[PDB]
Design a protein around this ligand. Sequence first.
Ligand code: CIR
Ligand code: CIR
Ligand code: CIR
Ligand code: CIR
Ligand code: ASP
Ligand code: ASP
Ligand code: ASP
Ligand code: ASP
Ligand code: NA
Ligand code: NA
Ligand code: NA
Ligand code: NA
Lengths: 402, 402, 402, 402
Amino acid sequence: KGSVVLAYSGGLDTSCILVWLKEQGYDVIAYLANIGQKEDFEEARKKALKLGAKKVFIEDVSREFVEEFIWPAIQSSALYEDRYLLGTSLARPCIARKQVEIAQREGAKYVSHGATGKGNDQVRFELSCYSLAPQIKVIAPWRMPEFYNRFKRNDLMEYAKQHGIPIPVTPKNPWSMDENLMHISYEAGILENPKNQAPPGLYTKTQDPAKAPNTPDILEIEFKKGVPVKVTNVKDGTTHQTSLELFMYLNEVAGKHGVGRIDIVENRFIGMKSRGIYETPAGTILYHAHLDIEAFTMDREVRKIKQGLGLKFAELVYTGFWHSPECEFVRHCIAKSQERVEGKVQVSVLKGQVYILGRESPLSLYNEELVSNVQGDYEPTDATGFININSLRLKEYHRLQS
Amino acid sequence: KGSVVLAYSGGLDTSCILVWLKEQGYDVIAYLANIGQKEDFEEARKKALKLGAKKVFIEDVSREFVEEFIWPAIQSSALYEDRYLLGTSLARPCIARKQVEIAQREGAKYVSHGATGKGNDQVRFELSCYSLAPQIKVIAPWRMPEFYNRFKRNDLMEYAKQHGIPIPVTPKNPWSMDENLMHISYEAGILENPKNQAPPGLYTKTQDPAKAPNTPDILEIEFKKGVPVKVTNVKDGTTHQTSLELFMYLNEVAGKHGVGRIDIVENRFIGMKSRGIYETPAGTILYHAHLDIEAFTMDREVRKIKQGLGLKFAELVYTGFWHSPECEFVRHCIAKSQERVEGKVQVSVLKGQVYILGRESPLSLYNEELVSNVQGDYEPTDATGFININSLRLKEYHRLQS
Amino acid sequence: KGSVVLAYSGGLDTSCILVWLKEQGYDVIAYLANIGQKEDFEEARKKALKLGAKKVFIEDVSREFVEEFIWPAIQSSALYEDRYLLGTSLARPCIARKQVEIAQREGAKYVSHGATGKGNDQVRFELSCYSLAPQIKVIAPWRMPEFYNRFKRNDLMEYAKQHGIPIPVTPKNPWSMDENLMHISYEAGILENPKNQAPPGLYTKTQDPAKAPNTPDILEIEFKKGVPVKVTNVKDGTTHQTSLELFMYLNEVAGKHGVGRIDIVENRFIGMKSRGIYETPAGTILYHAHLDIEAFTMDREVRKIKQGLGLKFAELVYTGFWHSPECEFVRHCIAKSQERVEGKVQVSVLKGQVYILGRESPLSLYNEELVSNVQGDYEPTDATGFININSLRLKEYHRLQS
Amino acid sequence: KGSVVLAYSGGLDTSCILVWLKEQGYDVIAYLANIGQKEDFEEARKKALKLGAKKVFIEDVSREFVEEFIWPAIQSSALYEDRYLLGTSLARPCIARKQVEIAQREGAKYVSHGATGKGNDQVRFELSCYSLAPQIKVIAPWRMPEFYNRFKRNDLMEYAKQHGIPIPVTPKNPWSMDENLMHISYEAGILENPKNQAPPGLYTKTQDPAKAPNTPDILEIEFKKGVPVKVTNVKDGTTHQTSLELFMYLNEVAGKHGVGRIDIVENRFIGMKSRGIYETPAGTILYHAHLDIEAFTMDREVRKIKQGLGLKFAELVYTGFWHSPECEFVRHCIAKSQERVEGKVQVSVLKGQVYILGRESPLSLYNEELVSNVQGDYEPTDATGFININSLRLKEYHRLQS
Ligand SMILES: NC(=O)NCCC[C@H](N)C(=O)O
Ligand SMILES: NC(=O)NCCC[C@H](N)C(=O)O
Ligand SMILES: NC(=O)NCCC[C@H](N)C(=O)O
Ligand SMILES: NC(=O)NCCC[C@H](N)C(=O)O
Ligand SMILES: N[C@@H](CC(=O)O)C(=O)O
Ligand SMILES: N[C@@H](CC(=O)O)C(=O)O
Ligand SMILES: N[C@@H](CC(=O)O)C(=O)O
Ligand SMILES: N[C@@H](CC(=O)O)C(=O)O
Ligand code: NA
Ligand code: NA
Ligand code: NA
Ligand code: NA
């Protein structure tokens, strides 16, 4: 009994959980985070009311998702375990934070979610909830015996049918999906056998690289403070100079050319290896563009220190520690390194690949004249000394193990 | 005076240097490292004799280049500054080591090279020479005033003409190339303006992704101890189970599909930023395949420690410290992590991109049953404790800065 | 019901737990790890039998504790959070491993321990048990509601009195102690207020530095492969050339001079900060001696890579991950670095401090002649080049943010 | 010819260099950095004028040395190679910066110093000079053939005698000293044999721990933002609440009790190992006090990230890169971590050792109640889940290499 804010999506799990928490005594507040997925939110709201929700909040959270979450992730220049661009992992603290906000506003003692007992997301939601509101209580049905021993997915379907929970007819895929503005992830079902290949009908956000356009899209991406501020199509003249709008245009450009597809096995914070395929179109373009622009504008030695911090950032976000003193310090250090990260990157998007074509920047650390056929401000005799003393170690070390 | 072993390639710089060291008193031993480039070595030998070389050594160094250099680089899973696969950087210690070997055999007091005063390669050659033979002497003409002030590239052409040094007619490109078995690099001339895009005729080793085959090549790559031992084409049945032969077939497959192209600005050991484009076809396939197979067969926590070592490996190789106690220790630690890195990766090569399709391994750390819709060996109640104590910090830290 | 191997010490907690597990249905095997503490093990055995133990194992585990645990810890050159020498943290995997060994021999389905619910040791025992024997079951009464809600320390005393559990008369100190061969730790009770100073009667293993001898003890410590193999007193001639015997002599020497005292606040694996004072006499001498000898015999760059691994080692041991693939890999890498770590360190032990006096080694990387008033094998002109190119960055970076 | 600012100390080397640069055509500006050493600066000024200096600048640089250099070094909590507190290494950028400032004011084209060709200090002076003023020119006589081949220390003495350069009568020690406010270092001569022990008359700044007071000094040190702001003697009531004054009082307290003595072999930026003994009295107290106060007030995970940065700081300072973008970024990150580092540490100074006695802070992350015999805000059942899922890896990893 009391009021619970449930992170609700409209699917079987969270439809059932709504009804279940209601059967258990709770007044349920259905909370629909609109984060760039393809939902008919109004109908999901109607469905939630029919199901017995006391209240429905649809929060459009896309712009702040781009600007407060995706932007620092690009600044980081880092990939979880050298492959994962963190699409879902970034979204959870964005979702959880608004959920806590709705709960404290409503005077609700409990929050709730439909994440499974073997996942990362359970951790991410709940670490942010406790971090931001130490006194909130969580109900995670998939970790409740009374719940998880009863619905041992076809047991859940039956539960739906018995309580008149509607099942869309659209029909089910033998995997689960997570979709937001940044990516789409597909993970259970048939994909659990890491020997088995994605069927072609799996890929919903990117074109098949064999069907993709024959002409590339050539874009110019402008950065300031490590994040994109402008996208212009060099050919057709299209321009976007606001965050969400440029990001979606990059999704639409990259998806059109089949860009952003990975197939990976990853290691889950609880310690299970999991097999996932991902579609991160815009994220893939920006990952590469940003690397090129920070490398052009950053000191060599700042960069290696900064990249260690990013690596740390990637692991903290993946495991669910966005709202922590350590990720806050790390985000601050990463932000600081990006002060001069600005300029323009020319890129080409074609057949499932992004290509860097050129770059320029008024804050460039590049010196065309110095690296030159012409001399210039350099003494070749210096280098001789530099080599010769770097070798002293090296010649010691040989003579003395000889 | 005395005998000098010159790392000779047959191009303008090292043709001129041969003649110059000869004019200076030295007996010149011309040393042609055959490392998978496209030279007519026999003619380069003839050219070296005509030029006044006392002696010519052509060393076919390809197999040991793959097995002793490229193999540990793949084990490392690392990229210099997140982009560079180290093609040229790996080759130098292979070349320098054989040069020192030829010099000590011949009783030659000096070795020599045609690397410029602003490069990485000068460092790599000479650090390995001193490391392996502390008493050898180096002649690096590009760092000698008597030499570099006189040939302030058209001054070098004149020198050639005046000493009857032949100039191929093939004509010059407004950039310099470095080619070996692993890659091709292009760097000076027009490419020095990082705003300027590679002209299409630049790309000699990879197909244009717009001209590349419409059907992919699907390959199965087998690893053992972190390095490829087998490549089989799933369609046409082609099989290679020896190191050099599988590597070249992967070059030929990846080059055919336009795979392995980068355009980057990098930071040079002497501290100048430089602009380079690279073609690393096989290297690009193996980079991705190996990542997938180590991730499937490696403990999560071994992996992050191991990846720090790889990062260290990448920097040590780039800067020229292959032959050092620190790179030796690092290579040893990296090798040790790879003991269980084995299995089979299914990959697709199409339109300038490599795709992972699936993987399997008898040393897999994957548990299909555990990660599953079915229960299994897991207690969902555990995770609740795991979350709740990970939050204790986190809730402390909020209350106490409140 | 069934048989349980209880890590038993003879104190109130584990005396009560013995009786409690017996009341609960279990046959209790009392397991006394002799690890260099000051117990009357035979009487603790008698006490355990009187209490209803089916069986008593006293295992003298000291020599293997020194040689398999303390030795790799010294090789590591690392301190948990720059202060803690890990005395108790090292002991647990030594104790747990023998416990699992006794349990599997006996055909016992369960193991048990008296560690509290807020500690590190619960984690260390149980992570090693599961790691070494995935199928064993743990009973940790302090985490059982039926147990911990009933004995909310005076409730435990009453339980003792009501079951005729003997209480020594020796009387209690308002803190808890953990003692082994390596150290003694004191932690709860009055010490929980980190503002409060240790009372003088707290310190049982080290002399008060104000009462300590006026003449120092000067010792020569010999290392091989990073671990001490010989201790000789320079004055009185005492010599120990076996592991356990030299270690105890160093405890006895350091304790005599008041060496090895710390007072720290540390952060506990579950995330609570805790206040602890420690006495690690021999450990403190060896920490300093070994640092001096590895620094004399190790390459500069091997050292920083190695020290990162040690840091990792310290955290893995503190948190309870000795028996893990990551600590195993790290111990292996650390061992490998120590191959040349050998020689002789002259040290002085006086008034709560250790002093390094000198050192020597046939595997020294020191060059007296080179570092010299005399020239020698060096070119001062080299250094000029080395400085000048290290500055190129540095001068770039100024001009280009000017 | 032209004007040169020489970092002058008044000793044989820099007295001779003054006269030599004058003989070579230059107008010499003698620059005496007063950095807390024991010079009679007025007489050194008189000596410099007699010697032919056009000008003499005595700069009292002590307060800014403490506040801008030593303070960030304490914030760092780090030791070069786990032993060296960086006394001399910190001073050089302080000295070099004022030298560049004097040179640019005077319109002097050149700066100069008497550091040897095999040292660290040559690097530190000159990297800061170039970093701060890319166009200045350096004269480093010890790297000039015309100079260093002529004064092959008794050749320098003769040079003095022949030019009427006064030699103090005080007589020479068979080692060189470097002294400032932070420490004293002794290094060449007899100490070059790392087997040889410091003679007792070597130690000028610290009492012999055998002669040191029988009663300790108990001090309370207050920190704010990671740096000491107050020192009060608990017994005698002495109080210092300004930076330089508290630092000197801590030198005077620690020196009185024999605190701050080390004997080490270190590895020099050019790659030679060197043997040095150091006396860092106040630095030693503050190193330990600050560690205790940051550990009490810092998040566990902020701390390990922060300590990596400090480690980086220590190496950047030792090698001479204070004035670099990477040390600037690192100092900024380190400063940021210290925002909450504040409170009071009770310490005891006795017989060559410092002891932590207690600590307190209004920004404490310590929770007496939580870590407690009393329950409190904790669920012991949580920890069971935390252990059990930390073991899942661990049990996997065993079954799958079984
Ligand atoms: N389909 C999903 O449920 N995706 C969520 C998990 C995706 C990815 N493994 C992650 O942990 O962020
Ligand atoms: N074209 C070339 O001369 N390539 C050699 C340099 C390539 C790359 N920047 C490297 O340093 O390894
Ligand atoms: N007195 C004790 O119970 N000592 C055990 C804990 C000591 C130290 N904090 C550790 O965790 O290893
Ligand atoms: N006596 C000295 O000349 N000391 C300066 C060097 C001390 C120490 N090895 C350092 O490099 O900072
Ligand atoms: N969202 C999925 C996967 C994950 O959380 O990592 C789950 O709840 O199981
Ligand atoms: N090989 C080229 C580039 C390099 O060495 O990095 C040179 O000698 O300048
Ligand atoms: N041994 C003590 C302290 C610790 O484990 O860290 C306990 O059980 O609580
Ligand atoms: N100051 C001494 C030592 C050093 O610089 O490290 C020298 O000039 O040689
Ligand atoms: Na709340
Ligand atoms: Na030789
Ligand atoms: Na078992
Ligand atoms: Na200037």
